[PDB]
Ligand binder design. Structure first.
Ligand SMILES: [Mg+2]
Ligand SMILES: [Zn+2]
Ligand SMILES: [Zn+2]
Lengths: 49, 65, 98, 388, 49, 76, 56, 451, 243, 51
């Protein structure tokens, strides 16, 4: 119900995504039904500093 | 929040194969071949299609005129 | 109606802002706790007790010369345990002893 | 070229150089055994003076402020160490940041004192002789050689109890057993299995109140010298060093065998009354340094020496706050912004007093340039000035 | 949240340490840093009142 | 049997004759009352028999500049 | 006569302020320069006429 | 410039104010600029220097066998500001292809007269350092070919502007003591140092970037034989503790002098296990080679400690709280999963598994007790420090150094005849001493004799 | 803007480099976030490495790996499955550097880590003060972004500037950015004089005009402080001294 | 009254005299860039127009 609400400061991240590997508990709580974040694809190396 | 029409790393259209994916996987057809059976080679395109939530149907019900 | 089913509730909507009472961890009323040893005096016991709003402390200390005192909130000035015991309701020495 | 010929070239050049550099340079410049000839030797001395001449402090510095900040910065990075070391002798000496706070303040009392005792040329390499000294200073009453106390039944009235073996394996001197009646209050007599019993067959004073007898006889034992405590020995570089707990300076020097010229003591005050004031200054410096080195960090010695010298400026050592320098004389305004209570001490100055300025906080409150830094320079310039 | 009623500044070393009884009643890790640290704690997931 | 001397913490205090007072006081261009001031107690002054209104010359060793001098008075 | 660090800063600071309010400049031509940077080039050539009264 | 501010980069904020009046502005630029503060007044050493990538990249650039092809050399001298003419010359190795030894490219930065030699952290063979240590004393100028080309990787030897032997690590740059950046600011003013510092940074970065410096997950792996080696150590160390407990029960204790019997038992136990953890650490420093991308960071000094690399493939060790072992719990035990009255190794908080293999439920809870300790302390230690500093500032801020070299308080009471036991400023003195005769002799005698 | 994983690798976006100059793997993958390798074997977050491999296996297979504490997917299965899917077991690959273009002479790790954007966004931190409205009765600048304020120059900031020796810089910063009031002091009395408009002249109380009165510049704050002493029976004689 | 006016632990030394917020300033987050000289600082162009 974010679009019908009055609150001092709210946030809305456009495209959230379900986290690849998670915990079994997170599904039984309801975090998977309204998540908060995205899956990047990271490489580890030191670039130009 | 309807499926990202492009992937986030590899530029390739992807919305046109979301729906056809979902209904087929919700009948028992194993995901590891459905994705393969379509044009999804690298895994970078694959992550955005596997993990997504499409909340748009719940939010649409409420209105703001 | 206009609510989301995932909302668990448990808060008030006083004056617009959503206020919630965070539970406060008490120190077990109507109990007895024997305090430690040999810092300034000997051992002391402390008991919190509340009855209708007010909560007061009642220690029955015994400092290292055997006086054995009691603290009262209103005006510190400790009194001997046997002094206070007779002012309460036990007269004979056999009463206290037994 | 030889020894005597370079003891003169240095000599007439030593005027811009200092005393210490004279001894060091000659000794070292000699000790290079492939020894150069003459012309270059002059050049080295010529070069050396340039470095020294370039190292002096620029007059106008603010040595007070940088000394405070450099000592107050590592306190933030004062992390833990291996507090449970694999050592034995020194135990619970209160390291860390709270140690620094104790030395920066006066405090007659301080928590866990230790005094260090070295020994002369007979006790320096032998275990049996170091122990006799140690045993002579420990000092054991009667309330430590026991486990508890209770009373008896009818006429016995009291009893002394376990244990008795603290003399027949440690070696604490049966001759002094007879001594005990040295002006003692009561003192009965029953040395059976080494544990002296004490029977009192009397009256009205004590009957069974075994608590108040603490201040009596029980505390009044004296099985040793120097009413101080535990004594731990340690071989510190083939020398036995005696580490004692507590402190008792007046009577420790008057003990056979303790070398009086090398004992150092962690108690700041006791060193000032026995050794002297200047010796207290050295004790301040040494102690702060010791703390920093055992943490890893290092701080340059000139900062510590400034604070230590400045603190002993009256003869009597006084704390750095509220009872010392900020409380002592400054200008009247330099105590107005410190510990607001001032309405008894502030009105004191109202009876015959002046003030010029030249502080730091007075000039910043009034709008004048402070006398440190650039403020201490004055310019002058002749005014024809044809431009050309 | 479960809160304790003490002083936010003076150090209570014996009140902040994770006591053994917290197992299964109070979360061992969830504790916000700052001047509080240890005073405010969180209920474990598997605990009834 | 000991003394204030012969110890690794107390340096050798010595006293100046009357002449050197004026000579010293001209160099640093200062008044008499502006010097540090020991007390009439503490062994290092009473052993040498010093009177109030004196400038004791204390020479102490500093592990950086070698030999460094100082000057102090005595009051009650 | 070698300046100390504190005296150097002051001389520049004093000299720079004079250059703003008039006070003709020596050869210091290039292109548009602040009054501060003007004092730096003049000092680098050792032509600053301000002498330090030394207290001695 | 991010040791002096003590800043990191995870959101920390800084403010900037701009002075206005011409006297104030001038004063700020001459007296407070960054280059005048490379050495810190607290200790005699450089404060502004190379950090994490700057040190680690410097090692890869100067190891035995770092041959950079012609294209790369050319490309990187243009990345580091320096501006040379047609002298890359002359191609040390032309066997495979015409190419350049790593030492010569680094040598293009030091001025043409720096002679310095010092042992550094990466040495591991105190004999091979010493075989070369005599050939510098009794000759002072040899031919470079004989035994300097019989070089080691841990004995920095620079002679008249040429790095013959040695490798660069945290003994050249860095926030703690580095005796290369140190010497270059004393000998050759202040303005030179910033260019040498600046050009080293952009150089060292360009090699590290284009060369590849990742860490994977196999960097912490040990084979099956080494794993079994650690396991037998943990079994014996446990059984040693059990034997002492049985001795305590039967009253054959043999107790320590000072502490009481109950504390003697604990004192003996902690020493037994601390040896066993460190013994496992010696095994970890032995088997996994020095040529993977993780140990390299540990031995040079760029976010390293050999103690944590070993703590990722071996025992964690005991777990303590302010000294004593874990006692705070139920009436007779720590957790309710052990039997009442067990002072054994495993029961009283000793984790046996590492972070790779994974912690069990009992052990994981024990580790949390030791981690809250570090959290609480750090915020408390700051409180006492800040107040304490306010005391000493409001007591010493008045002192100045007069022109005759005398420190006087504002009432003319002379606090110190000849400042700081005269007369060298701590910002310019050599590790507590002054002028340093041992350095000046070697320096001037070498420049004249060498010609 | 601030980004941080769910393990504790807090960080700020450093540069938003064009897609072309980015090193890429001998396949079609182009990395999105390049993390400094000095942060993993320093903090000891082995869980970060395991999650990277775990996301790669999970994306290829198609099922979501279960990672709950203590009963999660055993470490050895993800490494043994990753190989049979067609990838070096260790997570590393051959990468080509996008700037020039040649393989790095090492293998470069790559994974699928779940990040999350935190709300400490730069739009709510940056603000500047030129010269704002201040208090009237106490005369100090205001606080916050809704009333245009930054931080203050109190106790510690004076002592640092004194340490350098910047006398001139000091004065400008702490006083001149307020009010400076000029008052006429009598030389032999010490008491503040008194004007009179319409005639245009000064006049101190005790001595009538003959005695040379002199101008003195001081901070308005200090003038009020003298008055408080003057309201009592204390006389603050200001004895001036010549240039 | 007067003795609570000049002092009373919160009067007019530490409150308004010896410490103030100042003018001509700015405050924001920092991010790295090793491609500028050791003494230079990058200032965002929005802040450059307000000072
Ligand atoms: Mg930070
Ligand atoms: Zn993709
Ligand atoms: Zn007048």
């Amino acid at each position: 119900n974010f679009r019908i609400r009055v609150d001092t400061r709210g946030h809305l991240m456009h495209y959230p995504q379900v986290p690849l590997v998670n915990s079994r508990i997170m599904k039984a709580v309801g975090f998977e039904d309204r998540p908060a974040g995205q899956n990047f694809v990271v490489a580890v190396l030191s670039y130009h500093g | 929040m309807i499926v990202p029409v492009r992937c986030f790393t590899c530029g390739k259209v992807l919305a046109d194969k979301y729906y056809e994916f979902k209904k087929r996987v919700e009948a028992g057809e194993d995901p590891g071949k459905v994705l393969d059976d379509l044009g999804v080679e690298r895994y970078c395109c694959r992550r955005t299609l596997l993990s997504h939530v499409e909340l748009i149907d719940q939010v649409m019900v409420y209105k703001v005129y | 109606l206009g609510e989301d089913p995932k909302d668990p509730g448990g808060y008030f909507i006083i004056n617009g802002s959503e206020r919630v009472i965070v539970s406060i961890e008490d120190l077990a009323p109507n109990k007895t706790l024997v305090e430690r040893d040999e810092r300034q005096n000997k051992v002391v016991a402390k008991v919190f007790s509340y009855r209708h709003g007010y909560r007061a402390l009642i220690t029955v200390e015994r400092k290292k010369d055997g006086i054995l005192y009691v603290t009262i909130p209103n005006v510190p000035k400790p009194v001997k345990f046997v002094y206070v015991m007779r002012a309460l309701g036990l007269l004979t020495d056999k009463e206290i002893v037994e | 070229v030889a020894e005597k010929t370079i003891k003169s070239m240095v000599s007439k050049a030593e005027l811009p150089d200092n005393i210490k550099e004279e001894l060091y340079a000659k000794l070292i410049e000699y000790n290079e055994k492939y020894k150069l000839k003459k012309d270059e030797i002059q050049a080295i001395i010529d070069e050396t003076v340039r470095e020294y001449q370039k190292a002096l402090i620029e007059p106008g510095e603010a040595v007070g402020t940088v000394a405070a900040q450099s000592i107050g910065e590592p306190s933030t990075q004062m992390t833990l160490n291996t507090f449970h070391y694999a050592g034995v002798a020194e135990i619970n000496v209160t390291l860390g940041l709270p140690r620094i706070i104790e030395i920066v303040d006066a405090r007659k009392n301080p928590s866990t004192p230790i005094m260090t005792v070295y020994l002369d040329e007979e006790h320096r390499y032998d275990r049996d002789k170091a122990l006799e000294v140690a045993r002579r200073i420990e000092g054991t009453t009667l309330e430590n050689l026991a486990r508890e106390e209770t009373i008896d039944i009818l006429n016995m009235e009291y009893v002394v109890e376990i244990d008795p073996e603290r003399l027949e394996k440690a070696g604490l001197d049966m001759e002094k057993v007879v001594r005990k009646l040295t002006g003692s209050f009561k003192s009965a007599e029953f040395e059976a299995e080494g544990y002296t019993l004490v029977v009192r067959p009397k009256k009205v004073t004590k009957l069974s109140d075994l608590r108040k007898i603490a201040e009596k006889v029980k505390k009044h034992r004296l099985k040793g010298l120097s009413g101080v405590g535990k004594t731990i020995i340690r071989k510190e570089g083939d020398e036995y060093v005696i580490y004692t707990e507590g402190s008792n300076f007046k009577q420790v020097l008057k003990v056979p065998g303790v070398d009086p010229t090398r004992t150092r003591t962690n108690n700041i005050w006791e060193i000032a009354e026995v050794l002297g004031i200047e010796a207290a200054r050295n004790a301040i410096i040494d102690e702060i340094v010791s703390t920093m080195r055992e943490q890893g960090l290092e701080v340059d010695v000139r900062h510590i020496m400034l604070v230590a010298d400045m603190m002993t400026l009256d003869g009597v050592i006084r704390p750095i706050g509220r009872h010392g320098i900020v409380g002592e004389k400054a200008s009247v305004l330099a105590r107005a912004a410190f510990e607001i209570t001032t309405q008894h001490l502030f009105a004191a100055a109202e009876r015959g007093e002046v003030d010029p300025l030249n502080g730091v906080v007075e000039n910043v409150l009034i709008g004048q340039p402070v006398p440190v830094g650039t403020g201490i320079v004055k310019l002058a310039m002749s005014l024809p000035l044809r431009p050309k | 949240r479960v809160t304790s009623p003490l002083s936010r500044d003076q150090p209570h070393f014996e009140a902040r340490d994770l006591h053994g009884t917290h197992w299964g009643r109070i979360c061992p890790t969830e504790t916000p840093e700052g001047p509080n640290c240890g005073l405010v704690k969180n209920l474990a997931l598997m605990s009834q009142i | 049997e000991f003394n204030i001397f012969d110890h690794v913490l107390v340096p050798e205090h010595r006293i100046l004759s009357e002449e050197e007072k004026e000579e010293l006081l001209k160099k640093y261009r200062i008044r008499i009352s502006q010097l540090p001031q020991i007390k009439a107690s503490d062994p290092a002054v009473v052993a040498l028999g010093a009177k109030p209104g004196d400038v004791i010359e204390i020479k102490r060793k500093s592990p950086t500049a070698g030999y460094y001098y100082y000057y102090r008075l005595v009051v009650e | 006569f070698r300046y100390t660090r504190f005296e150097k800063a002051r001389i520049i600071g004093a000299r720079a302020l004079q250059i703003a309010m008039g006070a003709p400049v020596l050869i210091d031509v290039p292109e548009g320069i602040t009054p501060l940077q003007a004092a730096l080039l003049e000092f680098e050539k050792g032509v600053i006429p301000i002498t330090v009264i030394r207290p001695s | 410039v991010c040791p002096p501010y003590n800043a990191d980069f995870d959101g920390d904020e800084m403010n900037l104010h701009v002075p206005q009046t011409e006297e104030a502005q001038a004063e700020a630029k001459i007296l407070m600029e960054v280059q005048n503060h490379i050495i810190s007044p607290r200790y005699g050493g450089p404060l502004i220097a190379g950090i994490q990538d700057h040190i680690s990249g410097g090692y890869l650039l100067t190891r035995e066998g770092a041959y950079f092809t012609r294209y790369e050399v050319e490309q990187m001298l243009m990345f580091a500001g320096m501006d040379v003419n047609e002298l890359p010359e002359p191609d040390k190795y032309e066997n495979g292809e015409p190419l350049w030894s790593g030492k010569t490219i680094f040598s293009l930065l030091l001025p043409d007269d720096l002679t310095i030699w010092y042992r550094n952290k990466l040495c591991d063979e105190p004999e091979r350092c010493e075989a070369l240590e005599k050939l510098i004393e009794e000759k002072l100028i040899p031919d470079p070919e004989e035994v300097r080309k019989l070089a080691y990787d841990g004995f920095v030897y620079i002679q008249n502007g040429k790095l013959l032997s040695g490798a660069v690590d945290k003994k050249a740059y860095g926030r703690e003591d580095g005796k290369l950046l140190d010497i270059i600011v004393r000998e050759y003013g202040v303005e030179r140092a910033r260019q040498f510092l600046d050009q080293v940074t952009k150089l060292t970065i360009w090699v590290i970037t284009h060369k590849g410096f990742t860490t994977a997950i196999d960097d912490e792996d040990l084979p099956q034989e080494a794993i079994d080696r650690i396991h037998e150590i943990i079994r014996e160390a446990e059984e040693k503790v059990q034997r002492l407990i049985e001795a305590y029960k039967r009253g054959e204790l043999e107790p320590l002098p000072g502490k009481t019997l109950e504390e003697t038992l604990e004192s003996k136990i902690m020493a037994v296990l601390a040896e066993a953890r460190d013994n496992a650490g010696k095994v970890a420093e032995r088997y996994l080679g020095m040529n993977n991308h993780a140990v390299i960071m540990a031995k040079t000094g760029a976010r390293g400690k050999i103690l944590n690399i070993t703590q990722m493939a071996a025992m964690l060790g005991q777990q303590s709280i302010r000294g004593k072992r874990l006692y705070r719990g139920y009436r007779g035990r720590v957790l309710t999963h052990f039997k009442p009255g067990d002072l054994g190794a495993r029961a009283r908080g000793f984790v046996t598994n590492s972070y790779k293999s994974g912690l069990t439920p009992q052990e994981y809870f024990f580790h949390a007790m030791g981690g809250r300790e570090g959290l609480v302390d750090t915020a408390v230690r700051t409180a006492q420090s800040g107040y304490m500093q306010r005391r000493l500032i409001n007591a010493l801020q008045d002192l100045k150094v007069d022109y005759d070299g005398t420190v006087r308080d504002p009432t003319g009471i002379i606090v110190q005849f000849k400042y700081g036991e005269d007369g060298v400023d701590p910002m310019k003195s050599w590790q507590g001493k002054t002028v340093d005769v041992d350095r000046v002799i070697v320096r001037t005698l070498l420049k004249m004799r060498g010609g | 803007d601030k980004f941080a994983s769910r393990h504790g690798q807090k960080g700020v976006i450093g540069l938003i480099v064009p897609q072309e100059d980015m090193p890429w793997t001998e396949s079609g993958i182009v990395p999105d976030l390049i993390v400094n390798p000095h942060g993993i074997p320093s903090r000891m977050t082995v869980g970060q490495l395991i999650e990277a491999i775990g996301g790669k296996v999970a994306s290829l297979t198609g099922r979501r790996v279960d990672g709950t504490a203590f009963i999660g997917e055993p470490e050895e299965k993800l490494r043994k499955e990753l190989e049979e899917l067609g990838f070096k077991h260790s997570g590393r690959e051959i990468m080509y550097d996008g700037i020039t273009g040649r393989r790095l002479e090492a293998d470069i790790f790559i994974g699928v880590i779940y990040y999350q954007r935190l709300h400490h966004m730069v739009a709510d931190k940056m603000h500047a003060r030129s010269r704002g409205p201040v208090q009237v009765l106490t005369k100090q600048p205001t606080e916050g972004r809704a009333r245009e304020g930054g931080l203050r120059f109190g106790e510690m900031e004076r002592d640092v500037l004194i340490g350098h020796g910047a006398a001139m810089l000091l004065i400008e910063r702490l006083l001149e950015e307020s009010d400076k009031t000029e008052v006429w002091v009598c030389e032999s009395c010490g008491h503040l004089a008194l004007e009179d408009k319409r005639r245009g002249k000064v006049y101190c109380p005790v001595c009538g005009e003959d005695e040379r009165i002199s101008k003195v510049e001081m901070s308005y704050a200090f003038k009020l402080l003298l008055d408080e002493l003057k309201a009592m029976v204390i006389r603050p004689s200001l004895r001036l001294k010549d240039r | 009254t007067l003795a609570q006016r000049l002092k009373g632990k919160e009067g007019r030394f530490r409150g308004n005299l010896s410490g103030k917020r100042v003018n001509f300033s700015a405050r924001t987050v920092i991010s790295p860039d090793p491609m500028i000289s050791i003494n230079e600082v990058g200032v965002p162009l929005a802040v450059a127009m307000e000072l």
